[PDB]
Short mmCIF file of all heavy atoms in Angstrom, two decimals:
data_model
loop_
_atom_site.label_atom_id
_atom_site.label_comp_id
_atom_site.label_asym_id
_atom_site.label_seq_id
_atom_site.Cartn_x
_atom_site.Cartn_y
_atom_site.Cartn_z
N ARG A 1279 105.17 88.98 78.21
CA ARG A 1279 105.78 88.99 79.55
C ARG A 1279 107.28 88.76 79.51
O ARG A 1279 107.94 88.81 80.54
CB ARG A 1279 105.19 87.88 80.43
CG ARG A 1279 103.79 88.10 80.99
CD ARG A 1279 103.49 87.07 82.09
NE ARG A 1279 104.52 87.12 83.12
CZ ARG A 1279 105.29 86.09 83.47
NH1 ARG A 1279 105.12 84.91 82.89
NH2 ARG A 1279 106.32 86.28 84.27
N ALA A 1280 107.80 88.42 78.34
CA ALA A 1280 109.22 88.15 78.18
C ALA A 1280 110.13 89.30 78.67
O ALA A 1280 109.82 90.48 78.49
CB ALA A 1280 109.52 87.81 76.70
N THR A 1281 111.21 88.95 79.35
CA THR A 1281 112.18 89.94 79.82
C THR A 1281 113.57 89.34 79.74
O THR A 1281 113.74 88.13 79.96
CB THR A 1281 111.93 90.44 81.26
OG1 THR A 1281 111.66 89.33 82.12
CG2 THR A 1281 110.81 91.46 81.32
N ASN A 1282 114.54 90.17 79.39
CA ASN A 1282 115.93 89.72 79.29
C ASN A 1282 116.87 90.74 79.90
O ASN A 1282 116.92 91.89 79.48
CB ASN A 1282 116.31 89.46 77.83
CG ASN A 1282 117.75 89.00 77.68
OD1 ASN A 1282 118.11 87.92 78.16
ND2 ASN A 1282 118.57 89.80 77.01
N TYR A 1283 117.57 90.33 80.95
CA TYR A 1283 118.51 91.21 81.62
C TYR A 1283 119.83 91.14 80.87
O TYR A 1283 120.26 90.07 80.43
CB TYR A 1283 118.70 90.79 83.09
CG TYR A 1283 119.68 91.66 83.84
CD1 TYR A 1283 119.47 93.03 83.95
CD2 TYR A 1283 120.84 91.12 84.39
CE1 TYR A 1283 120.40 93.85 84.58
CE2 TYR A 1283 121.78 91.93 85.02
CZ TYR A 1283 121.55 93.29 85.11
OH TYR A 1283 122.46 94.11 85.72
N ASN A 1284 120.45 92.30 80.68
CA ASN A 1284 121.73 92.39 80.00
C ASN A 1284 122.77 92.78 81.03
O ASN A 1284 122.99 93.97 81.30
CB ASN A 1284 121.65 93.43 78.89
CG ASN A 1284 120.66 93.05 77.81
OD1 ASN A 1284 120.81 92.00 77.17
ND2 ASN A 1284 119.62 93.85 77.64
N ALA A 1285 123.40 91.76 81.60
CA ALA A 1285 124.39 91.96 82.65
C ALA A 1285 125.54 92.86 82.21
O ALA A 1285 126.14 93.54 83.03
CB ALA A 1285 124.92 90.61 83.14
N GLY A 1286 125.79 92.89 80.91
CA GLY A 1286 126.88 93.68 80.37
C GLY A 1286 126.73 95.17 80.56
O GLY A 1286 127.74 95.84 80.84
N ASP A 1287 125.53 95.72 80.36
CA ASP A 1287 125.35 97.16 80.52
C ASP A 1287 124.25 97.54 81.49
O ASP A 1287 123.83 98.69 81.54
CB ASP A 1287 125.15 97.84 79.17
CG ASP A 1287 123.77 97.63 78.60
OD1 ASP A 1287 123.11 96.62 78.91
OD2 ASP A 1287 123.34 98.52 77.84
N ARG A 1288 123.76 96.56 82.25
CA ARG A 1288 122.74 96.80 83.26
C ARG A 1288 121.39 97.28 82.75
O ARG A 1288 120.69 98.02 83.44
CB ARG A 1288 123.28 97.75 84.33
CG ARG A 1288 124.53 97.19 84.97
CD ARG A 1288 125.03 97.98 86.17
NE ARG A 1288 126.01 97.15 86.85
CZ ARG A 1288 126.49 97.36 88.07
NH1 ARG A 1288 126.09 98.42 88.76
NH2 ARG A 1288 127.38 96.51 88.57
N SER A 1289 121.02 96.86 81.54
CA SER A 1289 119.73 97.23 80.97
C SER A 1289 118.89 95.96 80.86
O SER A 1289 119.41 94.85 81.00
CB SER A 1289 119.92 97.87 79.58
OG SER A 1289 120.41 96.93 78.63
N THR A 1290 117.61 96.11 80.54
CA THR A 1290 116.71 94.98 80.41
C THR A 1290 115.80 95.19 79.20
O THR A 1290 115.35 96.30 78.94
CB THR A 1290 115.82 94.84 81.67
OG1 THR A 1290 116.64 94.62 82.82
CG2 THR A 1290 114.82 93.69 81.51
N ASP A 1291 115.54 94.11 78.48
CA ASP A 1291 114.66 94.11 77.31
C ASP A 1291 113.26 93.69 77.79
O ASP A 1291 113.12 92.66 78.45
CB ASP A 1291 115.19 93.12 76.26
CG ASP A 1291 116.62 93.43 75.84
OD1 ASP A 1291 116.96 94.62 75.73
OD2 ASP A 1291 117.40 92.48 75.62
N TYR A 1292 112.24 94.46 77.40
CA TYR A 1292 110.87 94.21 77.84
C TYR A 1292 109.83 93.85 76.79
O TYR A 1292 109.79 94.46 75.71
CB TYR A 1292 110.34 95.44 78.58
CG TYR A 1292 111.04 95.73 79.89
CD1 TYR A 1292 112.20 96.54 79.94
CD2 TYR A 1292 110.56 95.19 81.08
CE1 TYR A 1292 112.84 96.80 81.15
CE2 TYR A 1292 111.19 95.45 82.29
CZ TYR A 1292 112.33 96.26 82.32
OH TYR A 1292 112.94 96.52 83.54
N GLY A 1293 109.01 92.86 77.11
CA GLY A 1293 107.89 92.49 76.26
C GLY A 1293 108.04 91.77 74.95
O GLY A 1293 109.11 91.24 74.62
N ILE A 1294 106.98 91.83 74.16
CA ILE A 1294 106.91 91.12 72.88
C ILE A 1294 107.96 91.55 71.86
O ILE A 1294 108.41 90.72 71.04
CB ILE A 1294 105.48 91.17 72.31
CG1 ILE A 1294 105.30 90.09 71.23
CG2 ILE A 1294 105.13 92.59 71.83
CD1 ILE A 1294 103.83 89.92 70.79
N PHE A 1295 108.38 92.80 71.94
CA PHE A 1295 109.40 93.33 71.02
C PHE A 1295 110.76 93.45 71.70
O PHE A 1295 111.72 93.95 71.10
CB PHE A 1295 108.97 94.70 70.49
CG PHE A 1295 107.74 94.66 69.62
CD1 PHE A 1295 106.68 95.53 69.87
CD2 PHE A 1295 107.65 93.76 68.57
CE1 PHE A 1295 105.53 95.49 69.09
CE2 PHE A 1295 106.50 93.70 67.78
CZ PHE A 1295 105.44 94.57 68.04
N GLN A 1296 110.83 93.05 72.96
CA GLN A 1296 112.09 93.12 73.71
C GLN A 1296 112.76 94.48 73.57
O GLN A 1296 113.93 94.58 73.20
CB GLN A 1296 113.02 92.01 73.26
CG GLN A 1296 112.54 90.65 73.70
CD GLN A 1296 112.72 90.47 75.17
OE1 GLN A 1296 113.81 90.18 75.62
NE2 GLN A 1296 111.65 90.70 75.94
N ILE A 1297 112.02 95.52 73.92
CA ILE A 1297 112.49 96.89 73.84
C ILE A 1297 113.40 97.17 75.03
O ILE A 1297 113.05 96.87 76.17
CB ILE A 1297 111.28 97.84 73.78
CG1 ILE A 1297 110.62 97.72 72.39
CG2 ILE A 1297 111.67 99.27 74.16
CD1 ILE A 1297 109.25 98.32 72.33
N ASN A 1298 114.56 97.75 74.76
CA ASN A 1298 115.56 98.03 75.79
C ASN A 1298 115.36 99.26 76.69
O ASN A 1298 114.99 100.35 76.23
CB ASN A 1298 116.94 98.06 75.14
CG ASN A 1298 118.05 98.09 76.15
OD1 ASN A 1298 118.56 99.16 76.50
ND2 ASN A 1298 118.41 96.92 76.67
N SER A 1299 115.66 99.08 77.98
CA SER A 1299 115.48 100.14 79.00
C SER A 1299 116.45 101.32 79.01
O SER A 1299 116.17 102.36 79.63
CB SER A 1299 115.44 99.51 80.40
OG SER A 1299 116.66 98.83 80.69
N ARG A 1300 117.60 101.16 78.36
CA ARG A 1300 118.61 102.23 78.31
C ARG A 1300 118.15 103.43 77.51
O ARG A 1300 118.52 104.57 77.83
CB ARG A 1300 119.91 101.69 77.73
CG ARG A 1300 120.98 102.74 77.49
CD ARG A 1300 122.35 102.10 77.52
NE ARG A 1300 122.60 101.46 78.81
CZ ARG A 1300 122.74 102.11 79.96
NH1 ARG A 1300 122.71 103.44 79.99
NH2 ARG A 1300 122.95 101.44 81.08
N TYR A 1301 117.27 103.19 76.54
CA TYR A 1301 116.81 104.27 75.68
C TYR A 1301 115.30 104.47 75.54
O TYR A 1301 114.85 105.60 75.38
CB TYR A 1301 117.36 104.05 74.27
CG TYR A 1301 118.67 103.28 74.21
CD1 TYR A 1301 118.69 101.88 74.24
CD2 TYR A 1301 119.90 103.96 74.13
CE1 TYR A 1301 119.90 101.18 74.19
CE2 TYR A 1301 121.10 103.26 74.09
CZ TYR A 1301 121.09 101.87 74.12
OH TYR A 1301 122.29 101.18 74.11
N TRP A 1302 114.51 103.40 75.64
CA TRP A 1302 113.08 103.51 75.36
C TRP A 1302 112.03 103.58 76.46
O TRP A 1302 110.97 104.18 76.26
CB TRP A 1302 112.71 102.43 74.35
CG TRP A 1302 113.68 102.37 73.20
CD1 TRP A 1302 114.69 101.47 73.03
CD2 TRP A 1302 113.77 103.29 72.11
NE1 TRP A 1302 115.42 101.78 71.90
CE2 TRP A 1302 114.87 102.89 71.31
CE3 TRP A 1302 113.03 104.42 71.73
CZ2 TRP A 1302 115.25 103.59 70.15
CZ3 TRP A 1302 113.42 105.12 70.58
CH2 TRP A 1302 114.52 104.69 69.80
N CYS A 1303 112.26 102.92 77.58
CA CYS A 1303 111.28 102.97 78.66
C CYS A 1303 112.04 103.12 79.96
O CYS A 1303 113.24 102.86 80.01
CB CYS A 1303 110.41 101.71 78.70
SG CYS A 1303 111.30 100.16 78.99
N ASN A 1304 111.34 103.58 80.99
CA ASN A 1304 111.95 103.77 82.29
C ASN A 1304 111.62 102.65 83.25
O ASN A 1304 110.44 102.31 83.44
CB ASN A 1304 111.51 105.09 82.92
CG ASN A 1304 112.17 105.33 84.26
OD1 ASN A 1304 113.39 105.24 84.38
ND2 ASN A 1304 111.36 105.59 85.28
N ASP A 1305 112.67 102.08 83.85
CA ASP A 1305 112.51 101.04 84.86
C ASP A 1305 113.21 101.46 86.15
O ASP A 1305 113.28 100.71 87.11
CB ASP A 1305 112.95 99.65 84.35
CG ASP A 1305 114.44 99.55 84.01
OD1 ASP A 1305 115.21 100.53 84.12
OD2 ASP A 1305 114.86 98.43 83.63
N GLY A 1306 113.72 102.69 86.14
CA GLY A 1306 114.40 103.26 87.29
C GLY A 1306 115.74 102.68 87.71
O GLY A 1306 116.50 103.36 88.41
N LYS A 1307 116.05 101.47 87.28
CA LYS A 1307 117.30 100.82 87.67
C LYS A 1307 118.39 100.73 86.58
O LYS A 1307 119.39 100.05 86.76
CB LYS A 1307 117.00 99.42 88.22
CG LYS A 1307 116.37 98.48 87.22
CD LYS A 1307 116.09 97.12 87.78
CE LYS A 1307 115.38 96.29 86.73
NZ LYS A 1307 114.76 95.05 87.28
N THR A 1308 118.18 101.37 85.44
CA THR A 1308 119.19 101.32 84.37
C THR A 1308 120.01 102.61 84.43
O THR A 1308 119.48 103.71 84.31
CB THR A 1308 118.53 101.10 82.97
OG1 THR A 1308 117.67 99.95 83.03
CG2 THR A 1308 119.57 100.84 81.89
N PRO A 1309 121.33 102.48 84.70
CA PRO A 1309 122.27 103.60 84.80
C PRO A 1309 122.30 104.43 83.53
O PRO A 1309 122.24 103.87 82.45
CB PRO A 1309 123.61 102.89 85.01
CG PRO A 1309 123.23 101.57 85.61
CD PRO A 1309 122.04 101.20 84.79
N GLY A 1310 122.35 105.75 83.65
CA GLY A 1310 122.40 106.62 82.48
C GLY A 1310 121.41 106.35 81.36
O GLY A 1310 121.70 106.58 80.17
N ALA A 1311 120.21 105.89 81.72
CA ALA A 1311 119.16 105.59 80.74
C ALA A 1311 118.20 106.74 80.49
O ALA A 1311 118.03 107.66 81.32
CB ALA A 1311 118.38 104.38 81.20
N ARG A 1312 117.58 106.69 79.31
CA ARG A 1312 116.58 107.66 78.88
C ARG A 1312 115.25 106.91 78.68
O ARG A 1312 115.20 105.67 78.72
CB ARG A 1312 117.00 108.35 77.58
CG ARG A 1312 117.89 109.56 77.77
CD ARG A 1312 117.64 110.51 76.60
NE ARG A 1312 118.50 111.69 76.60
CZ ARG A 1312 118.66 112.49 75.54
NH1 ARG A 1312 118.01 112.23 74.41
NH2 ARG A 1312 119.49 113.52 75.61
N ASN A 1313 114.19 107.67 78.42
CA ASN A 1313 112.86 107.09 78.25
C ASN A 1313 112.20 107.74 77.03
O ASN A 1313 111.26 108.53 77.16
CB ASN A 1313 112.07 107.38 79.53
CG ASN A 1313 110.67 106.79 79.51
OD1 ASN A 1313 110.29 106.07 78.60
ND2 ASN A 1313 109.90 107.09 80.55
N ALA A 1314 112.69 107.41 75.84
CA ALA A 1314 112.16 108.01 74.61
C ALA A 1314 110.69 107.69 74.32
O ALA A 1314 110.04 108.47 73.63
CB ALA A 1314 113.04 107.66 73.40
N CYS A 1315 110.17 106.55 74.79
CA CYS A 1315 108.75 106.25 74.55
C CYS A 1315 107.87 106.87 75.63
O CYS A 1315 106.62 106.87 75.52
CB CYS A 1315 108.49 104.74 74.50
SG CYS A 1315 109.28 103.92 73.09
N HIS A 1316 108.53 107.40 76.65
CA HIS A 1316 107.86 108.03 77.78
C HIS A 1316 106.80 107.11 78.37
O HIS A 1316 105.63 107.45 78.50
CB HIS A 1316 107.35 109.42 77.41
CG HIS A 1316 108.45 110.40 77.14
ND1 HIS A 1316 108.74 110.89 75.88
CD2 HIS A 1316 109.38 110.95 77.96
CE1 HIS A 1316 109.78 111.69 75.94
NE2 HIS A 1316 110.20 111.74 77.19
N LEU A 1317 107.27 105.93 78.76
CA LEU A 1317 106.45 104.89 79.35
C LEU A 1317 107.25 104.17 80.42
O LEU A 1317 108.48 104.12 80.37
CB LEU A 1317 106.12 103.81 78.30
CG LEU A 1317 105.16 104.03 77.14
CD1 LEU A 1317 105.20 102.83 76.22
CD2 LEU A 1317 103.74 104.23 77.67
N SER A 1318 106.54 103.62 81.41
CA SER A 1318 107.19 102.81 82.42
C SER A 1318 107.45 101.52 81.64
O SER A 1318 106.64 101.14 80.77
CB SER A 1318 106.23 102.50 83.57
OG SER A 1318 106.66 101.33 84.27
N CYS A 1319 108.56 100.84 81.92
CA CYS A 1319 108.84 99.59 81.24
C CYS A 1319 107.71 98.60 81.56
O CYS A 1319 107.46 97.67 80.81
CB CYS A 1319 110.21 99.04 81.62
SG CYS A 1319 111.61 100.05 81.00
#
């Protein structure tokens, strides 16, 4: 359930591996982000 917001670039790290929203999952609120794992965060 761990989550970490990164105020610096507006992304968030999700879960046990703290995977970042800018490149790996979609949370809809990260500017210029991609979803390489093709999963909702």
Side-chain angles (χ1 to χ4, degrees):
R1279 285 193 55 239
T1281 45
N1282 180 64
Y1283 179 59
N1284 296 300
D1287 76 334
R1288 302 188 167 194
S1289 67
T1290 299
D1291 303 323
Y1292 293 89
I1294 198 170
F1295 294 129
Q1296 290 288 280
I1297 288 165
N1298 191 264
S1299 61
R1300 174 155 300 292
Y1301 333 84
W1302 314 101
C1303 61
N1304 182 51
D1305 63 359
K1307 62 180 176 194
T1308 307
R1312 274 209 184 165
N1313 182 6
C1315 294
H1316 293 110
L1317 289 173
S1318 157
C1319 292

